[PDB]
Amino acid sequence: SNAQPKKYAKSKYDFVARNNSELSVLKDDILEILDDRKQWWKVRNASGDSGFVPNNILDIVRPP
């Protein structure tokens, strides 16, 4: 719907932030991928919070 759509991931697991730089997420949460350049991706959750989550708990979500 936009020329540059937002990219999303779905978490496979519950993950609890170990510090305030990481982002706690739940299994099946949908997360905006803000930065996937490293092993820890910066993502944003539905509440607008952002932080880092491990790449390996995330599955890419297909564009509509």
Binding site: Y13, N19, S21, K38, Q39, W40, K42, F52, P54, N55, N56, I57
Partner: peptide, 12 residues
């Protein structure tokens, strides 16, 4: 469950 990758974000 998967082991976490090494941290590669910056902290403080």
């Amino acid at each position: 469950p998967p082991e976490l990758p090494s941290v590669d974000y910056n902290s403080l």
